[model samples]
Target: NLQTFELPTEVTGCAADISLGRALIQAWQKDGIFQIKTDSEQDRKTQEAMAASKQFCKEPLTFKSSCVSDLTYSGYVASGEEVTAGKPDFPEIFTVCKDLSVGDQRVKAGWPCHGPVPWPNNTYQKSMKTFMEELGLAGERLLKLTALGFELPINTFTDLTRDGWHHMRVLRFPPQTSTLSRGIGAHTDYGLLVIAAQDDVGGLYIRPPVEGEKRNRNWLPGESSAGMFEHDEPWTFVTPTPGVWTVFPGDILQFMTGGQLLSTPHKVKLNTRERFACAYFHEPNFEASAYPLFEPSANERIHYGEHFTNMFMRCYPDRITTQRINKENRLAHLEDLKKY
Candidate 1:
């Protein structure tokens, strides 16, 4: 029933802003994340709304963070999927911000309602979307910078992801249920880039690439596999800074760059008080194939839509319908390609 949502022109404006492009590039060079020293009117407003979102967690409608949408008021993404190595499941909810024309492929891929659950009224929904757009703007600038850094044309990725999938997710974690107290399991994001706005609750951690071993922790030797974290491998804490959004590359970005860039494995360690964060994920167009701009030794092409669907299904097995369709489409697409 929550179908007719409006897209603002200002969102496009925010995404195209290049004023901070150079600064962002510099920050990425130092580390994947950067803190904005000064606060803007937009950041202030966004933070306020983020803090306000905590209210939804309270009271009579106490929602469980299940993969199915039925249990929660809105579409919720539960943590601790099948791939998660005994990690605890956390509650998260998200909305896809796009035009009305972007259809069924989105919903089938677990893209949910645009605003927080319980509606919270039209005005609140609009504000959240606006906040998302602001980050979307930042995300766009970073993507451009990424392209330029790799000696590719600035518009190289911009053109490809124009009608791509963009998602804004809000995560709320309750008090500890385990001694380890994991907020989200260690995993790489399923997009090209991720821009996150986190509240002061802190507890975010990231495992840097093996080549860059500058962190103050133990080290694991030799060639280890992705998502294969051993007790010896170091996990650095990404301490929170006020008004700053953490920007980092994701799995697709690493593949796109032919592994030139690193997709840091990140997770949250939480206990005690509540925590909240908003993340914006930008990927290639649904129909676009995962082809590297700078070719590697081998070519492994994957359709963005198919890869997305598979990731979702692996994480949320309960999404049976989407999984079935995804498998069928992949086989059909492969067969079609064989003819050509």
Candidate 2:
């Protein structure tokens, strides 16, 4: 059985600490990088309850409510228990875009039926919106700094995300003692940037790119023979800092920079305690196209919406295909699949 709690509405964004701008840029230039969020007691309780809810496992294949439609999931797969569900099997447990009504028309269209579900009231929706807005603003500040580092216009990267497709997800990792199990499997984020606010338990790790193995996009944890680090590739742990956010570049950034930017492969491991992380994924506008910044020869444009759809299709084939049909081909329609 799982618990249920309420989300508070006092959360808001913090001011930009651009003091580390240069350091961040250099680090990102060296390797693709990696939020401090203040959560009240009530907030923490709400998250715990949400993660524990047996409802997430009630019908693995069924969409019982709009909240579930937002992609809430559970089980060994959701928790990344490797022995139970490995690559191509473990479903990422999360909810996309908790509150959509506050953004632009495109945002609403992109997530037509997004709202906090399973909770008895609408308080969760209100609180999540406040949290996302702050996180989004913080991400914007970081992007501007990145632009400066690359000697581009301050708004260069920021422009791509105006009215963009962003999703803030709450992830809970159940405790696992198996050496093979992971909190989340190895994979790079698919968006432009990922800002994560994690709990104190710390299990996240990143395997930086090796010198010659350019195409090694494999998803294997450290325990498996296949997961063994090659070329002595190091697995670095990310320590969770209250109110400090960790950022990571994603596949989109690598594409935009013609591979000049690094999109490090990362994963999560759970052993001692359960973990919780709030990840804010920033992306370009759904209809916008992405092009390489430095590699004009490879400057083919890719539609953000189409790219996103294709990625989702690989992860949730049946659900995505069905939603695409029911929503009349609008990718946004998949955001809210009716549970009926």
Candidate 3:
């Protein structure tokens, strides 16, 4: 079972002394994932995002396509639009980065993932942004708590995250009549932190990493590696609880800390009922570089933007994306982060 904790609504709630930090670090170090109870404000905003997500579910494909893009990584992405380790993922997604206006410098420079959001409706746009703003603050607060627990300066992540490349996506895994198993293929998230909300039809699961233990990374936890809800993988259900968000550290943090902490691999498995969920990806500045904290000399300096583009290119196999991959020779960067 996943450990559950109350998310500090602000920095003050996380000011525990070293002894208290002991338990906090232990839990996170053990599993690399946890569920958090939020303040009333976060709860309200999260619900609003969920409402817009539900509204998005009824939207027609034509309207949804207006937001769809392989180039920008903003807007609607239909099922089969993105993939995990290559094959199409099962859920539909509506992704948004920081709500850059057309006149923003990054937008003018035509940076990848820096563009105006093509909203479906006023309500969807309004609700999503407000929730995003609230969540961004909350993300910073968690960073502080993480720093506190790890015996590091509280502001270790603060400067790194301001003007951050925060990203969000609302996902819908439509109902399956049979015992459908496929969903997001197994993987760790690519950035700093993740705050996720899933409706009651939860299918999220994870395998807590263990020392000297190896399992097939390619094996689908849901579909028997070779389906009767039976499997060889050691996956445990993170069954959803209302008014709470799940949080996890991501690859950047793992890299930055030189693996004192970790980023765990997680996935979703579809069941008979539809599942609606949202994930807030809290990333560092696009220009900021991720280098190992201890060894500045033995560095694998990966700028956040470089990794983001690599992930987008790997997942979307559209014509435009494919062309850019070839022209830009993007495949050259793939092996760099293959350490995970």
* lDDT, residue 134, model 2: 61
lDDT of 3 by residue, 1-340 (tens): 6666765455753445433445555766787677877778888988888888888878788887777543366788887677676566778898887777878865564556556677788889888988888878878877877777777777877777879889997899877544557788777776788889888888987656566653231112342211111244666688788778887877787777776656666778887888988989999887777777767697576577777776666677673645655665544533433332
Q: Which stretches of candidate 2 lie over 4 Å from their true place?
A: 1-21, 34-66, 70-92, 98-121, 177-179, 215-232, 320-340
Rank list by TM-score: 3, 1, 2
Better of 1 and 3 by lDDT: 3
Residue range with the least summed lDDT across 10 consecutive positions in model 1: 1-10
TM-score, one value per model: 0.73, 0.69, 0.85
Clashes of each: 1, 8, 0
Quote model 2's TM-score. 0.69
User: What local lDDT does model 2 show for residue 179?
Assistant: 59
In candidate 3, which residue pairs clash?
none
lDDT of 1 by residue, 272-340 (tens): 777788777887775677777776555676566555655554555555334544545544653444344
Cα lDDT listed for each candidate? 0.56, 0.54, 0.71
Superposed model 3: Cα runs more than 4 Å off: 12-22, 69-71, 177-180, 214-232, 319-340
lDDT winner between 1 and 2, please give it: 1
Candidates ranked, most accurate by lDDT first: 3, 1, 2
lDDT of 2 by residue, 108-129 (tens): 5544333323432345445555
Global fold similarity of model 1 (TM-score) = 0.73
